[PDB]
Structure 1
Amino acid sequence: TAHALKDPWFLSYIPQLTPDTVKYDFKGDWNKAKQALQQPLDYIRTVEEFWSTINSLPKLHQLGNGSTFIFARNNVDASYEAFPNGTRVLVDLYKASVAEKGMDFVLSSVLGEGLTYDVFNGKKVCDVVRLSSRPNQESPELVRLEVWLSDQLYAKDVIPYIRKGLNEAGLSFTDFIMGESTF
């Protein structure tokens, strides 16, 4: 009937979340801007819900610069403070079209627990996936995906697995760039 995910995931939206907008809100306090700007969207509990939610998301680049979608395992807080020995595997997707093929690969791999059994040996290292509109002068449709890891030790294994998966999803070397930002 309804095919339950290993864990439910909470989907949230932060409109035009830029490092400059946190000046309008409390200077230091991130929690203030978060409580103010963040909108809840969906609670994804099943595979059927996952695909309706994914295949019904508004295009990131068509929402303003800095606009962010957050998928949080068991409704956890997507804050860097929550994962002290953690990191975030970055994927920059240059076109709007490739960002769609890339998001499908990464979200199915994470929420579908592909990463868990292929890279983490059954451990739930990933609890957050973030997607944001990050245009630049050269790339107006630029989208950033972030795969947050509980432990940095797995990043060196997550980067080639995601890269191979993206190349297998039909993305070339120029379609995306792999990155890493520690916590």
Structure 2
Amino acid sequence: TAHALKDPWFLSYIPQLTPDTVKYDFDWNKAKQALQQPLDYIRTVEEFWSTINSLPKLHQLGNGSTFIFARNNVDASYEAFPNGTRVLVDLYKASVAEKGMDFVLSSVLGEGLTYDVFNGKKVCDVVRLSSRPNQESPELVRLEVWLSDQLYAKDVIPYIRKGLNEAGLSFTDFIMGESTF
């Protein structure tokens, strides 16, 4: 009937997930346990597209509101990925952030990164998408591409930036970054 992804990805939502909100939650395990909401289990390309299209625009939700796409329903914990890293993308307008999200998700879930960068290795298991507004940029959206190995971030950063340029985004439309685990 429909076309299976290489792996199903579980989609969850953590509302207004901020560092000073885990102040209300003293521990990470219990903050997630209580706040995370399950949204869907993407098995196919058809399921993928309807989910991506149905997603309520990140900036509209509260500051810190994250969407987690976790390969084979893995726990998106830094703890789970010790030799890893997370490639960051900040998108200044909500308009560009749609095009950007569509690229980064199609590259991850569609195994684009896997066969274009990792030579077959499934290095990416988590993609987080959250609202991170500034007094400066209030429509700001952040994408995190989680890696199992930091050796690859050196190659994920030019690949994602090149893809985003091809997707229509200028250099003022986004900023690439990294955060070690």
TM-score scaled by structure 2? 0.99
Pick the aligned partner of 1:172 from 158, 170, 175.
170
Give the CA deviation at 1:103: 0.2
Local SS of the residue matching 2:55: coil
> Matched residues in 2 for 1:181 and 1:50: separation?
27
1:28-76 CA-to-partner distances (Å, cap 9, x unmatched) read: x100100010000000000000000001100111110000000000000
Give the CA deviation at 1:160: 0.3
Equivalent residue number for residue 3 of structure 1: 3
Q: Percent identity?
A: 100
> Matched residues in 2 for 1:2 and 1:181: separation?
37
Give the CA deviation at 1:175: 0.2
> Matched residues in 1 for 2:111 and 2:131: separation?
25
Equivalent residue number for residue 153 of structure 1: 151
Equivalent residue number for residue 49 of structure 2: 51
Give the CA deviation at 1:119: 0.1
Give the CA deviation at 1:139: 0.2
1:68-121 CA-to-partner distances (Å, cap 9, x unmatched) read: 000000000000000000000000000001000000000000000000000000
Local SS of the residue matching 1:145: strand
Which structure 1 residue ranges, 5 or more long, are not aligned? Answer: none
Local SS of the residue matching 2:89: strand
> Matched residues in 2 for 1:61 and 1:54: separation?
15
> Matched residues in 1 for 2:60 and 2:88: separation?
21
Give the CA deviation at 1:24: 0.5
Q: Work out the number of aligned pairs and report it.
A: 181
Give the CA deviation at 1:123: 0.4
Equivalent residue number for residue 38 of structure 1: 36
CA RMSD of aligned residues (A): 0.4
Which structure 2 residue ranges, 5 or more long, are not aligned? Answer: none
> Matched residues in 2 for 1:23 and 1:162: separation?
34
- Runs of at least 4 residues off by over 2 Å: none
Give the CA deviation at 1:154: 0.2
Local SS of the residue matching 1:11: strand
